[PDB]
Amino acid sequence: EDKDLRSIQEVRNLIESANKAQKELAAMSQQQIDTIVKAIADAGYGAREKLAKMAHEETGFGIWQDKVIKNVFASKHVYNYIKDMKTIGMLKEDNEKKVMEVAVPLGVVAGLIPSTNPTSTVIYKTLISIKAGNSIVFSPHPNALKAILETVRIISEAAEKAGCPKGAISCMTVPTIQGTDQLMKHKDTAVILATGGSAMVKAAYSSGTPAIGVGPGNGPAFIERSANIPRAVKHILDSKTFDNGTICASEQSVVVERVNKEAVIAEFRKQGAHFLSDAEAVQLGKFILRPNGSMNPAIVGKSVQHIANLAGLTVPADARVLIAEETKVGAKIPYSREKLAPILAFYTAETWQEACELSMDILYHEGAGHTLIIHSEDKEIIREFALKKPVSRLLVNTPGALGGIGATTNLVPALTLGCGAVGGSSSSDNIGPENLFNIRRIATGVLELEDIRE
Amino acid sequence: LEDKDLRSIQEVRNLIESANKAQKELAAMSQQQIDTIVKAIADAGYGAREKLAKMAHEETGFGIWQDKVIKNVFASKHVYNYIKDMKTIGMLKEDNEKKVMEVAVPLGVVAGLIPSTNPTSTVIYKTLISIKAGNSIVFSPHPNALKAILETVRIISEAAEKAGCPKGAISCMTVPTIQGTDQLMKHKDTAVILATGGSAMVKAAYSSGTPAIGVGPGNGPAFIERSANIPRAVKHILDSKTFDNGTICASEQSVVVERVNKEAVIAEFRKQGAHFLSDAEAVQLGKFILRPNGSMNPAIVGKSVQHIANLAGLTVPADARVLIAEETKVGAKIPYSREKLAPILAFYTAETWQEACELSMDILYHEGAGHTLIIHSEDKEIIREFALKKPVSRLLVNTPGALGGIGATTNLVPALTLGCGAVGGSSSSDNIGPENLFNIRRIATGVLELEDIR
Ligand SMILES: [Cl-]
Ligand SMILES: [Cl-]
């Protein structure tokens, strides 16, 4: 009866079921696997509306119409990338080196699901884990529980119809920290896909189980002197306002040069941004930064009007983002940190070199290894940013949120965006099927001992 | 500070701090400048081959002087020849079709755990690959090999620094403590752990909060299938199993033969210097090898046949090259079915290749899964079945186990850190090198709008 014990029991039950379900997947051919993958894609996509509405209603986060596009992306876009990849059995036979390469599935994948992008992340993690021959057990955020449970129900039913063994795709029905702890620590858990906060990722790397973790997204968008101002402002608003800023790859600040500063402020205003007065900025800043130095969860995925009301603000009805001018960087400077909300800091640099230095300083305090955006027509400046910005994905003339996940760019389509070693993670990739299998190499003898000691 | 544990913690924080600064200096260097240092390390390692082999032999008491010189040659010359022309620094790729550029990003400060079994060769190799990828490295020495490791570090460090490398980029703890090595693994500025050592050590690395890459126990069966060339299969198994008195983890731990071939195989093993133990002698050595706590006796590790025979109270001919015990069982309570880092083999008889496979899987699933299995066969179909099914990361065909698994007699990546992958509890199945020690940053240009994906 006690909730944590039942949760720990259920976790042990799901992993066991998932372990034997994977052994059955492992026996399947590439064609049999792809038949399953396409069926998960279709069920995910067919239920795009219902799951998007479910998630919005339960979490109170975002915009259901935007969650639909997240579901479409997680289904069709990921499917289209992964459909023709060889991920199963014999991959390569080098007949000159005499080395053969075979894909080995990891085993049971433990997927931690955020409340910010719940149904889309479930679909994405399922497609890529099953594609690589793995079973997946999900850890749902308590306040997106029903949405995630129905996503798992819908996609696992379609997979099982297409030949997938029962138990290969499952989810905790009783969310506890103790339960999630067990899922992570379990001997028969092969890898943790750790999409969550910084304490949750640190836990996953302290679990004993190999983990693939994320960091906070604190991505500046530098609008450089040669950028088309209208297009840059459009890209940023497209991303920042997408699902009320729930995607980690969305812009957290705008950096402008002195030459374009006012031209950019005016364009933001013209496209519906609201600039906070100095007084309005500190008032919201006081509300955003909690006494313990945490960022206020009360803003996450909420509307501009919702956030204004919480902060004691009165803001125009058609305001699309709140923007505050910022000069400093630090743990006590909330505008310099991740605000999963339609709230942006606004920085001014005199030159592109000053903008690079400020971005480094922003990223080093928070957001290193994740995302930075640059709007520019200058090939030389973009290349300097490419060689120096401490991120894993550097986005050029594109909306941040959409560009970072590979919706508007040719990055790998993903909702797990690895932050690399600088962010404390084991990978910097947009996670796909190639991150979820090992290579076994089968090598023939080419030399004798007598050759190597001569 | 005078207490040993606190002096050691202090040292590790100082060492990490220097390595942190030094890496930022390495991070500014071109591929040319890096490769110059790499070559200087390789040259210094190679030149000190006899010196360092003798130090390690005298200090640890393990192995054969001659064989450790070869390992020092392998770690320097062979690793260097694989890495010298590899692209590991800065801009790697510029895809103009996808509009995606790729840039190598060094991990940062590497933590190298060095075992007493392969101590000088492992330092040389890890240094070369870390520095090649633009990283610094701080070593944790096994206390039984402290002096030899420190002197290897001293030697390659000075040649690196003479070649342009920043001071503090290559360092080693001078006071080995478990409290100091815990600090090395857990530290925020430590970017990655190369975890070469025992099972409790690698489980410690994955519990540290820092990204780890671990090894597993090597327990590889050698299946001399009926199509095999017996005299060469025997020579290979002996070449590997007696190499440094069996200290390398990719060396064979059992021989599996088909019944039709058993007589012929035993006769050849005998001709080439193998000594088959009687039932009573096998039982006597088994009692000595297996400790009451369940661990295997360290007293046998890297020791001669005669030395072990004396320890176990056996009387064995002076020219005996390996001790072979016939075995029928697999399990924790069965010492021959487990990793014996010594010139000792189990010998199993199966009826068919199918039974040999099933037996091999049973061996590996108890101990050794993810590491190595060796097969001698001229049957490419049976080999392919083993390739697709045996739970290992490296499957060796017609080659000595120790020498083929490290890539000395095979075309596998030349390495002394052999990942066991997920099945063995690690993040990688690779023979690891430069490409496991940088992240890829991707710089991507927008190709689509929000409206397009709507
Ligand atoms: Cl979603
Ligand atoms: Cl050595």
mmCIF file with all atom_site columns, N, CA, C and O and ligand atoms in Angstrom, chain A residues 67 70-71 117-120, ligand 1:
data_model
loop_
_atom_site.group_PDB
_atom_site.id
_atom_site.type_symbol
_atom_site.label_atom_id
_atom_site.label_alt_id
_atom_site.label_comp_id
_atom_site.label_asym_id
_atom_site.label_entity_id
_atom_site.label_seq_id
_atom_site.pdbx_PDB_ins_code
_atom_site.Cartn_x
_atom_site.Cartn_y
_atom_site.Cartn_z
_atom_site.occupancy
_atom_site.B_iso_or_equiv
_atom_site.pdbx_formal_charge
_atom_site.auth_seq_id
_atom_site.auth_comp_id
_atom_site.auth_asym_id
_atom_site.auth_atom_id
_atom_site.pdbx_PDB_model_num
ATOM   1  N  N  . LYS A 1 67  ? 1.852 22.411 -29.119 1.00 0.00 ? 67  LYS A N  1
ATOM   2  C  CA . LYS A 1 67  ? 2.123 21.020 -28.727 1.00 0.00 ? 67  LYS A CA 1
ATOM   3  C  C  . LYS A 1 67  ? 1.787 20.030 -29.831 1.00 0.00 ? 67  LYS A C  1
ATOM   4  O  O  . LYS A 1 67  ? 2.364 18.944 -29.866 1.00 0.00 ? 67  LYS A O  1
ATOM   5  N  N  . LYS A 1 70  ? 4.752 19.983 -32.037 1.00 0.00 ? 70  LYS A N  1
ATOM   6  C  CA . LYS A 1 70  ? 5.736 19.167 -31.306 1.00 0.00 ? 70  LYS A CA 1
ATOM   7  C  C  . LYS A 1 70  ? 5.506 17.674 -31.469 1.00 0.00 ? 70  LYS A C  1
ATOM   8  O  O  . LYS A 1 70  ? 6.475 16.921 -31.590 1.00 0.00 ? 70  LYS A O  1
ATOM   9  N  N  . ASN A 1 71  ? 4.234 17.259 -31.467 1.00 0.00 ? 71  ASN A N  1
ATOM   10 C  CA . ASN A 1 71  ? 3.840 15.863 -31.693 1.00 0.00 ? 71  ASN A CA 1
ATOM   11 C  C  . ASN A 1 71  ? 4.100 15.417 -33.143 1.00 0.00 ? 71  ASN A C  1
ATOM   12 O  O  . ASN A 1 71  ? 4.616 14.321 -33.363 1.00 0.00 ? 71  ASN A O  1
ATOM   13 N  N  . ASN A 1 117 ? 7.606 19.130 -22.241 1.00 0.00 ? 117 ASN A N  1
ATOM   14 C  CA . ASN A 1 117 ? 7.397 18.557 -23.570 1.00 0.00 ? 117 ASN A CA 1
ATOM   15 C  C  . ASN A 1 117 ? 7.033 17.063 -23.463 1.00 0.00 ? 117 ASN A C  1
ATOM   16 O  O  . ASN A 1 117 ? 7.721 16.221 -24.050 1.00 0.00 ? 117 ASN A O  1
ATOM   17 N  N  . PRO A 1 118 ? 5.935 16.726 -22.754 1.00 0.00 ? 118 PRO A N  1
ATOM   18 C  CA . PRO A 1 118 ? 5.775 15.334 -22.321 1.00 0.00 ? 118 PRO A CA 1
ATOM   19 C  C  . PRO A 1 118 ? 5.454 14.315 -23.410 1.00 0.00 ? 118 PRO A C  1
ATOM   20 O  O  . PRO A 1 118 ? 6.174 13.331 -23.526 1.00 0.00 ? 118 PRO A O  1
ATOM   21 N  N  . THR A 1 119 ? 4.399 14.544 -24.193 1.00 0.00 ? 119 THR A N  1
ATOM   22 C  CA . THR A 1 119 ? 3.911 13.546 -25.141 1.00 0.00 ? 119 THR A CA 1
ATOM   23 C  C  . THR A 1 119 ? 4.837 13.437 -26.348 1.00 0.00 ? 119 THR A C  1
ATOM   24 O  O  . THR A 1 119 ? 5.006 12.359 -26.916 1.00 0.00 ? 119 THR A O  1
ATOM   25 N  N  . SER A 1 120 ? 5.440 14.560 -26.718 1.00 0.00 ? 120 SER A N  1
ATOM   26 C  CA . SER A 1 120 ? 6.351 14.600 -27.839 1.00 0.00 ? 120 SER A CA 1
ATOM   27 C  C  . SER A 1 120 ? 7.658 13.853 -27.532 1.00 0.00 ? 120 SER A C  1
ATOM   28 O  O  . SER A 1 120 ? 8.195 13.183 -28.403 1.00 0.00 ? 120 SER A O  1
HETATM 29 CL CL . CL  C 2 .   ? 4.540 18.051 -25.896 1.00 0.00 ? 1   CL  C CL 1
#
